[PDB]
Amino acid sequence: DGFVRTLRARPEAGGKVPVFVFHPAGGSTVVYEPLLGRLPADTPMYGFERVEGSIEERAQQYVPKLIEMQGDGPYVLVGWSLGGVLAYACAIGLRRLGKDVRFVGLIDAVRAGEEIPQTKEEIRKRWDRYAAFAEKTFNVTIPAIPYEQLEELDDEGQVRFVLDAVIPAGIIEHQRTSYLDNRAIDTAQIQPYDGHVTLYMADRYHDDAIMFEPRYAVRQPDGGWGEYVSDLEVVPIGGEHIQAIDEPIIAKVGEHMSRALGQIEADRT
Numbered sequence: 001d002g003f004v005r006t007l008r009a010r011p012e013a014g015g016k017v018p019v020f021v022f023h024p025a026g027g028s029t030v031v032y033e034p035l036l037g038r039l040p041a042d043t044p045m046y047g048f049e050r051v052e053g054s055i056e057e058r059a060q061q062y063v064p065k066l067i068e069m070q071g072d073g074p075y076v077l078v079g080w081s082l083g084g085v086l087a088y089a090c091a092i093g094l095r096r097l098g099k100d101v102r103f104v105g106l107i108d109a110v111r112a113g114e115e116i117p118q119t120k121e122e123i124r125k126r127w128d129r130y131a132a133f134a135e136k137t138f139n140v141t142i143p144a145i146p147y148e149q150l151e152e153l154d155d156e157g158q159v160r161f162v163l164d165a166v167i168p169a170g171i172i173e174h175q176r177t178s179y180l181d182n183r184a185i186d187t188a189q190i191q192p193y194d195g196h197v198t199l200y201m202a203d204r205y206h207d208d209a210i211m212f213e214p215r216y217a218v219r220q221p222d223g224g225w226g227e228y229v230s231d232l233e234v235v236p237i238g239g240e241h242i243q244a245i246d247e248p249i250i251a252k253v254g255e256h257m258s259r260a261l262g263q264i265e266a267d268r269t
């Protein structure tokens, strides 16, 4: 299927408006199966899996596919983790092309409480933190970090440089894509969007997330989306980021989202 996974196929003709879901960091759209079970019967669902590039470059790949599949609209775009940002970026692209986007659902796609700087000083502090965790984890001494060579490299190049030093192909492939998908969240440059966004908000990021990047230890009440989205609804769901996508918490998301879908179906009926 390329990068589109069919979770529930739309009928040959007619039917309900499909929900387009976007993969999480380091994972696939199979994670949306619990959600799908909490959505109305015969709600079609398609998942957009990983593609390469910056967020904008990824949306430039998704948007033509969205249009091929759904045309003028209506568009319902949903994502947890990185998927939320991808969904949001696609919403901007679709709106810019005159399409009708009716719903953007961010499932705990929460920004760091303080903006993560994209600076050399930050690149050094980041790699120093990693090196220190490796020292403790692997009972090793890491020599001086070749900062100068690292600083000049993008995220992709940084991991290749690192993967020269150090393994089964599946693990390198899984670690590489997880790291890069997570950095993609970190460095996302949010643009403003004038349509409705629903943010399902958990209480906090899980411990591993925070150990990796302590700025995710703090969340703003709007999840960092308020300056960019004037039409913003927050649906608190509690719990941690990791749990937001699974039962039982997904039942709450599903109930709320089902109501939104019902109104959309009513509005076209």
Ligand SMILES: CNC(=O)c1c(-c2ccc(O)cc2)oc2ccc(O)c(CN3CCCCC3)c12
Pocket (backbone or CB within 6 Å): 026, 174, 175, 178, 179, 180, 182, 183, 185, 186, 205, 208, 209, 210, 212, 213, 216
């Ligand atoms: C739990 N580890 C992670 O979350 C991160 C990984 C990673 C690497 C390998 C793997 O197998 C699984 C994950 O690489 C990252 C890079 C930057 C970063 O800021 C983070 C933190 N992350 C927290 C959620 C909001 C987005 C940022 C991570």
